[PDB]
């Protein structure tokens, strides 16, 4: 799974 | 900003 | 998975 | 800015 | 996976 | 700026 | 994977 | 600027 922060 | 760890 | 921060 | 670790 | 920060 | 580690 | 910062 | 490590 991708790990994404915005 | 979000703080995200995976 | 990609790891991406914006 | 987001702080992201994977 | 790519690791990308912007 | 984002801070990102993978 | 590429590692990219902007 | 982003700070990015892969």
From Swiss-Prot, chains A, B, C, D, E, F, G, H:
It is found in: Cell membrane; Golgi apparatus. The glycosylation pattern (the amount of mono-, di- and non-glycosylated forms or glycoforms) seems to differ in normal and CJD prion. Belongs to the prion family. It is linked to PrP is found in high quantity in the brain of humans and animals infected with neurodegenerative diseases known as transmissible spongiform encephalopathies or prion diseases, like: Creutzfeldt-Jakob disease (CJD), fatal familial insomnia (FFI), Gerstmann-Straussler disease (GSD), Huntington disease-like type 1 (HDL1) and kuru in humans; scrapie in sheep and goat; bovine spongiform encephalopathy (BSE) in cattle; transmissible mink encephalopathy (TME); chronic wasting disease (CWD) of mule deer and elk; feline spongiform encephalopathy (FSE) in cats and exotic ungulate encephalopathy (EUE) in nyala and greater kudu. Monomer and homodimer. Has a tendency to aggregate into amyloid fibrils containing a cross-beta spine, formed by a steric zipper of superposed beta-strands. Soluble oligomers may represent an intermediate stage on the path to fibril formation. Copper binding may promote oligomerization. Interacts with GRB2, APP, ERI3/PRNPIP and SYN1. Mislocalized cytosolically exposed PrP interacts with MGRN1; this interaction alters MGRN1 subcellular location and causes lysosomal enlargement. Interacts with KIAA1191. Interacts with ADGRG6. Its primary physiological function is unclear. May play a role in neuronal development and synaptic plasticity. May be required for neuronal myelin sheath maintenance. May promote myelin homeostasis through acting as an agonist for ADGRG6 receptor. May play a role in iron uptake and iron homeostasis. Soluble oligomers are toxic to cultured neuroblastoma cells and induce apoptosis (in vitro). Association with GPC1 (via its heparan sulfate chains) targets PRNP to lipid rafts. Also provides Cu(2+) or Zn(2+) for the ascorbate-mediated GPC1 deaminase degradation of its heparan sulfate side chains. The normal, monomeric form, PRPN(C), has a mainly alpha-helical structure. Misfolding of this form produces a disease-associated, protease-resistant form, PRPN (Sc), accompanied by a large increase of the beta-sheet content and formation of amyloid fibrils. These fibrils consist of a cross-beta spine, formed by a steric zipper of superposed beta-strands. Disease mutations may favor intermolecular contacts via short beta strands, and may thereby trigger oligomerization. Contains an N-terminal region composed of octamer repeats. At low copper concentrations, the sidechains of His residues from three or four repeats contribute to the binding of a single copper ion. Alternatively, a copper ion can be bound by interaction with the sidechain and backbone amide nitrogen of a single His residue. The observed copper binding stoichiometry suggests that two repeat regions cooperate to stabilize the binding of a single copper ion. At higher copper concentrations, each octamer can bind one copper ion by interactions with the His sidechain and Gly backbone atoms. This protein is produced by a bicistronic gene which also produces the alternative prion protein/AltPrP (AC F7VJQ1) from an overlapping reading frame. This is Major prion protein. It comes from Homo sapiens (Human). The lineage of its organism: Eukaryota, Metazoa, Chordata, Craniata, Vertebrata.
